[PDB]
Each structure stands twice: as C-alpha cells, then as structure tokens.
Structure 1
Amino acid sequence: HWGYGKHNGPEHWHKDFPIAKGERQSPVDIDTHTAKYDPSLKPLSVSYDQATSLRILNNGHAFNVEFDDSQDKAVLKGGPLDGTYRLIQFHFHWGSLDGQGSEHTVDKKKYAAELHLVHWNTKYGDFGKAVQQPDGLAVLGIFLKVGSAKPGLQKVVDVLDSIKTKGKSADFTNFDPRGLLPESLDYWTYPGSLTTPPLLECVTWIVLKEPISVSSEQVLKFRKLNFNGEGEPEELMVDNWRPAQPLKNRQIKASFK
C-alpha cells in the first residue's frame, strides 16, 4: 500500500487518495513574515493533568502512544479552537539525518523531527466521526532539534526496542505527555489535513514556535525502528515525513508578534 519509498511515497498518494491535491492539504511551509498576528486569539490551554496513556504501537509508518479518551482527561482548548478536543494519540515524523525530518517547515527550514499530539472535537462523539468534519481534529505540532537530551522523552526511547517491527505493541501506562512540551506556547495556526493517507481535511493545525531539544543518542534510537514486520528484510524507519504542500487559498495566523 502507501509508504515513504520511491515507488509508494508522497508523490504517488494522489492516485488512491485524490484529496492529496486538495484545497487544504498539510504540511505547509510557515513563512514567518507572511503570518498575521491575531490578537483575537485566546491563550492556548493544554490540560494533560489526568492523561492516561495505555499502549505504544509500531504501525509500519511510525509509532503511536495511545491514550484513554473515554472521558475528558487530557484536553486541548482555547487558541483558535472552539470547544473541547480530547487527546487520543501522539507520534513523530523524523529523518535519516539531522537536517531533515519535520513535515512543516519554518521559512523553509527543516527540523530533525516533528511531534504530533492528536486531539478530536468531543462535539462529534468519537474520533471516526470527527475526521469527517472540517473542525474535527486539532493537532499540536512540536519541532525537535538535536542538542541536549529531553528527559521526558527517554521513557519512550527506552521502550522502542520492544516494538522494533510493524505490528508490535507494548504496554505504556503512566506516561506524562506534559514532559514533551517546550517552555513557550506561542504558535502558528491554519486549517489543514492529516499528513498521511487518507489525508482527510479535518485538521486545525497548531504549530509551536519553540522547538524542544533531543539528544543525538535519542534520535538515533528512533532510526533503529523498522518499517517492515518481523522476519522480513530490514527497512529502517526513517524519513517518514510528507514534504510541504501548496498553501493555496489559506492564511497562517500567529499568536505572537
């Protein structure tokens, strides 16, 4: 099916998923000098106090840390968002080298990786219904640059050996997502889509200005993961990012000056 290789990568996705050349596709390049400061935006509210992590899984494209979203235990509100959005999962996109890996880019600059915290609008009852709405999802994007280690990320790094191949999953209870956030919550926001098939245009993207730092050793372990399933020829899980798409008829708003 779809992938990130030469014969099934982003350049090929539009064939089975024509929305790939749609009206509001993601990611996009954030031209910092074109974004409009919007004083009408309210403060961003990240309430991960009662977040309950359950499991970590390698789905063949990346790995997801899933959360219990049966109640409002970990939610995102405020900013450009109307209503409450529940955290359902988070995952990363990274490169084979430190100079690439992020999906969104800032003034064309590519970061080593990008963290995506996925939330869905509770007014729609469930995730499956939410992805069918223009304001169904809110994804918080955080850039990762290589430098000093991120303490809150180590617990994830250490369990990657147990989910090396496609299909594998491990228990991952009691993980605190708050440990992955940078100091500042300043951000850029625009209407977009999922960055992987089915590329549904149901996302309000919230991209933080301040990146977090991870160590060379930490990212190296991400690159040891496999796209393939157990007992198959090894394909390192690297460069699982979609390149920037045309902004088209959209405007990027900034929460800061």
Structure 2
Amino acid sequence: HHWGYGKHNGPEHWHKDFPIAKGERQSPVDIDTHTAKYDPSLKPLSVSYDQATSLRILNNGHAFNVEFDDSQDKAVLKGGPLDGTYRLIQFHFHWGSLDGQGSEHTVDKKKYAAELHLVHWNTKYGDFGKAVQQPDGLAVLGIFLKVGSAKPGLQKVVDVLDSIKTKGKSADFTNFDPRGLLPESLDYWTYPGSLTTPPLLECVTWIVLKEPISVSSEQVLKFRKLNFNGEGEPEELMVDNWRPAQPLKNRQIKASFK
C-alpha cells in the first residue's frame, strides 16, 4: 500500500508515512503574483545546458524521468537566487487528466495543463543523495505547460513514451537537448520549499518561470497514454500525478521582475 496519486494513497494520505508532509516549507504553493515581492538584488538565472548528456528515460510508476550524466560539471544552473553551482540530474513532468489541471504550482489559483521540473543538486554536497539532506541541496527549475502550438523540442520525448508505457520500463535516451524545452524569458519567482513527492524533503530552492511553454493537444495526450501500473497489470492511466498547493506559512515569494 505504497504512496501514489490514486483513490486511496494520494497526497492527502502521504503524511502518515512522511510526517514532513505537514511541515513548514512544503511545495508546491500558489504564487500570489500581487503579493510576490520584486527583489532588485536577484540576479538573472544562468542556465548552461550546452554540454548536457542525457542517458536514459524511465517510467518510475509516478512520472517519467529523463536522466542526465551528472558525473562532471556539464549542465548547470547558477545565479538567480542561488549561491554556488547546481548540476542537472533529471527532468520530469506532472500533468492532468484534462487540460484544465496538471500543474503543481498555481499562479493566482490558475492551474496549467502540466509542469516541467528540471532537478539540480548543489555541487558543494558531492552528489544528489547527500544534497537532499541539506536545506540548500536542490534547485528545481519549474516551467508551466499550456496547450496550444506544439513544442518541437518536446517531440523526441513524446515519441519514446510508447517504449516505456509501464512502471519500471526504461529506454536509452541520448543526445536530448533540454534547451529546446525552455521559454523565451527567464523571468522567475523563487521561494524555499520541498520535493513534491515522498520523501517530501525540505531541501529545494524553487525557481518557477513566469512564461509558460506551449505544447500541442497531441503531445499531452501522449503523456496521458502512459501507465502507473507495471506490464501485465490492469491499466491505470498515468494522469493527475500532481500534488495540490500547500500552505505558504509566511514564506515570501520573490520575483525577479517588474
């Protein structure tokens, strides 16, 4: 009876196994754009993905992960609200059963169709497993997806999904460039938070881009053909794998703009 999103093991149950679910810096949150404080001291975000080395794609039974070789200083996030250098380890998405829901963060209560998370760990802690034990261990770049025109740079991901339909499937996934998933603007909001799935560790500096990317209806329909179940189990479509907004608890969300 492991955690998931389904009828009896979803977000409102997670606190029983992971009491930090009711902690002081949980994610995601609603971003109240009017109460976000412009911080002129924030720097432009530096996203250096030129040398990124994707390796594999994995259906982990919750989402799919596109995984990167993080054994050298390649694909790094720095600047913005960050001290130091954070290395890309994986990205994944959260999405809905319908275009009207799917994102984890909300903007003035608006839900997007989906949300991309590019997960990075602080190089001062040596790898990912040690970084998640620290309050400044991770930096996650969050990008909203709306349904409209296709995102050409997403199509290589969409096309491999049928090879990883079910939980625990993987496929070689080399030479994928995550720069093709980024919007024009790197304007962002930022706040201290957590993983959004168990173990819900309070180790993340969240950086949420204001400008969404557009994906097509056909691209997101393909995400909704994935399965939460393993091969040879009854089909449970992988949809609505998002945690709802959690209490802000007096944390301040800062804006890089306006």
Q: TM-score, normalised by structure 2?
A: 0.99
Displaced runs of 4+ in structure 1, greater than 4 A?
A: none
Residue 139 of structure 2 is matched in structure 1 by 138
SS at match of 1:120: strand
SS at match of 2:15: helix
Aligned residues: CA RMSD: 0.3
Q: In the aligned structure 2, how far is the partner of 1:42 from the partner of 1:113? A: 27
Q: What are the superposed Cα offsets for residues 152-186 of structure 1, whole Å, 9 maximum, x if unpaired?
A: 00000000000000000000000000000000000
Q: In the aligned structure 1, how far is the partner of 2:43 from the partner of 2:227? A: 41
Q: What are the superposed Cα offsets for residues 126-153 of structure 1, whole Å, 9 maximum, x if unpaired?
A: 1000000000000000000000000000
Q: In the aligned structure 2, how far is the partner of 1:40 from the partner of 1:137? A: 21
Q: In the aligned structure 1, how far is the partner of 2:150 from the partner of 2:43? A: 32
- CA drift of 1:5 comes to 1.1
- CA drift of 1:253 comes to 0.1
Q: What are the superposed Cα offsets for residues 222-257 of structure 1, whole Å, 9 maximum, x if unpaired?
A: 000000000000000000000000000200000001
Q: What are the superposed Cα offsets for residues 59-104 of structure 1, whole Å, 9 maximum, x if unpaired?
A: 0000000000001100000010000000000000000000000000
Q: In the aligned structure 2, how far is the partner of 1:99 from the partner of 1:125? A: 40
SS at match of 1:233: coil
Residue 182 of structure 1 is matched in structure 2 by 183
Q: In the aligned structure 2, how far is the partner of 1:44 from the partner of 1:214? A: 23
SS at match of 2:62: coil
Q: In the aligned structure 1, how far is the partner of 2:151 from the partner of 2:193? A: 29
SS at match of 1:12: helix
SS at match of 2:111: coil
Written as runs of structure 1 = structure 2, the 5 A alignment for 1:1-257 is 1-257=2-258
Q: TM-score, normalised by structure 1?
A: 1.00
- Percent identity over the alignment is 100
Q: What are the superposed Cα offsets for residues 195-229 of structure 1, whole Å, 9 maximum, x if unpaired?
A: 00000000000000000000000000000000000
Q: In the aligned structure 1, how far is the partner of 2:7 from the partner of 2:162? A: 27
Q: In the aligned structure 1, how far is the partner of 2:43 from the partner of 2:5? A: 37
Q: In the aligned structure 1, how far is the partner of 2:34 from the partner of 2:224? A: 33
Q: In the aligned structure 2, how far is the partner of 1:31 from the partner of 1:42? A: 21
Q: In the aligned structure 2, how far is the partner of 1:152 from the partner of 1:110? A: 23
- CA drift of 1:6 comes to 1.7
SS at match of 1:14: helix
SS at match of 1:11: helix
Residue correspondences, number: 257
Gaps of 5+ in 1: none
SS at match of 2:12: coil
SS at match of 2:242: coil
Q: What are the superposed Cα offsets for residues 91-121 of structure 1, whole Å, 9 maximum, x if unpaired?
A: 0000000000000000000000000000000
Q: In the aligned structure 1, how far is the partner of 2:45 from the partner of 2:25? A: 23
SS at match of 2:11: coil
Q: In the aligned structure 2, how far is the partner of 1:150 from the partner of 1:24? A: 33
Q: What are the superposed Cα offsets for residues 13-46 of structure 1, whole Å, 9 maximum, x if unpaired?
A: 0000000000100000000000000000111000
